[PDB]
Motif scaffolding. Structure first.
Motif, short mmCIF file in Angstrom:
data_model
loop_
_atom_site.label_atom_id
_atom_site.label_comp_id
_atom_site.label_asym_id
_atom_site.label_seq_id
_atom_site.Cartn_x
_atom_site.Cartn_y
_atom_site.Cartn_z
N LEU A 78 -2.63 0.35 0.39
CA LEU A 78 -1.87 1.44 1.01
C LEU A 78 -2.70 2.72 0.94
O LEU A 78 -2.58 3.50 -0.01
N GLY A 79 -3.54 2.93 1.95
CA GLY A 79 -4.24 4.19 2.12
C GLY A 79 -3.79 4.88 3.38
O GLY A 79 -3.77 6.12 3.46
N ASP A 80 -3.41 4.09 4.39
CA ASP A 80 -2.74 4.64 5.56
C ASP A 80 -1.32 5.06 5.23
O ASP A 80 -0.82 6.06 5.75
N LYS A 81 -0.66 4.31 4.35
CA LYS A 81 0.70 4.63 3.94
C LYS A 81 0.77 5.99 3.26
O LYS A 81 1.70 6.76 3.51
N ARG A 114 0.39 8.73 5.93
CA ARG A 114 1.63 8.80 6.69
C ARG A 114 2.74 9.46 5.87
O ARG A 114 3.56 10.21 6.41
N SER A 115 2.77 9.19 4.57
CA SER A 115 3.74 9.84 3.69
C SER A 115 3.48 11.33 3.58
O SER A 115 4.43 12.12 3.50
N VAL A 120 2.16 13.17 5.93
CA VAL A 120 2.63 13.72 7.20
C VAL A 120 4.15 13.82 7.21
O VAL A 120 4.73 14.82 7.66
N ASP A 121 4.83 12.78 6.71
CA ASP A 121 6.29 12.80 6.65
C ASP A 121 6.79 13.91 5.74
O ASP A 121 7.76 14.60 6.08
N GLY A 122 6.13 14.11 4.60
CA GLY A 122 6.49 15.21 3.73
C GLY A 122 6.22 16.56 4.35
O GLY A 122 6.95 17.52 4.09
N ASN A 123 5.17 16.66 5.16
CA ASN A 123 4.92 17.89 5.90
C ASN A 123 6.07 18.20 6.85
O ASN A 123 6.56 19.34 6.92
N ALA A 124 6.55 17.18 7.57
CA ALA A 124 7.70 17.37 8.45
C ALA A 124 8.95 17.75 7.66
O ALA A 124 9.71 18.63 8.06
#
Lengths: 51, 49, 49, 52, 53
Positions: free
Chosen positions: A32-35, A38-39, A41-45
């Motif tokens: 999980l390096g893409d995960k 993506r997390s 980015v989700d936390g940024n949102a």
């Protein structure tokens, strides 16, 4: 002189501690390096929506 | 290629210890004595998460 | 095999982008989270109850 | 071990050609072993090993 | 170059016996190592690497 310098560094490397450190780091994010990105980015949102 | 890498990433008058020397010095000074604290923090974070 | 130029260059550019001029921001994050977490941990017994 | 020589490299590979008695004014020379050895020694020496 | 044998197991290898391909390995050539390191170092953006460090 080059051999002496490389030997001085190699005596300080201590491969057992390097091995365990690298093993822990590789097992930290093995599949999980893409995960994680993506997390982030989700936390940024989420922060953009919560602040 | 060996000459190029040694010149580009090696010591300079501005940076006598070079990029790798500076980074190892800063990481050794910046985490001197924080190994146990970091281990405890990581264990606690992993358990809670 | 771990010195592939594509990955090295991508990681280098990304680190430059992320951590340029962010020392003050990270210092603020660390100070504020230290204070908040210390205040939260001072109520450990209350949280358990 | 050695066996030095000279190579003629032309990217275009066509067009006008040199005439006998002419001179090629643009050239390059490989990086010497001595400066590379010095650079490697200095780069490895500046590292603080105790910090490592 | 030379072949190194590490004996294992109890069954005797009969004459004209063939070791499986899964029990044998080929060397990592010195010229392969030089090729890999040089080709990888050619594409490096050294200014970006130094700035990141």
């Amino acid at each position: 002189t080059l051999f002496e310098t490389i030997t001085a560094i190699s005596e300080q490397v201590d491969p057992i501690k390097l091995n365990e450190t690298l093993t822990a780091a590789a097992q930290a994010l093995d599949g999980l390096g893409d995960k994680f990105g993506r997390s982030i980015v989700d936390g940024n949102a989420i922060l953009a929506d919560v602040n | 290629q060996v000459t190029r890498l040694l010149a580009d990433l090696g010591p300079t008058p501005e940076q006598p210890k070079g990029p790798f020397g500076d980074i190892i010095e800063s990481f050794a000074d910046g985490f001197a004595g924080k190994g146990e604290q970091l281990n405890r923090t990581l264990r606690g974070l992993s358990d809670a998460l | 095999r771990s010195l592939e130029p594509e990955k090295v260059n991508t990681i280098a550019t990304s680190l430059i982008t992320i951590f340029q001029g962010q020392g003050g921001t990270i210092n603020d994050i660390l100070d504020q989270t230290a204070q908040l977490t210390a205040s939260l941990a001072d109520r450990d017994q209350a949280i358990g109850e | 071990v050695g066996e030095q020589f000279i190579d003629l490299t032309s990217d275009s590979g066509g067009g006008a050609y040199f005439q006998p008695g002419d001179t090629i004014t643009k050239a390059t020379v490989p990086a010497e072993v001595g400066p590379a050895l010095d650079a490697a020694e200095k780069g490895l020496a500046v590292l603080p090993k105790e910090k490592i | 170059k030379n072949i190194e044998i590490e004996p294992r197991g109890s069954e005797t290898l009969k004459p004209r016996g063939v070791l499986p391909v899964g029990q044998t390995s080929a060397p990592y050539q010195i010229y392969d190592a030089f090729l890999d390191v040089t080709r990888n170092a050619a594409g490096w953006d050294t200014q970006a690497v130094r700035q990141s460090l």
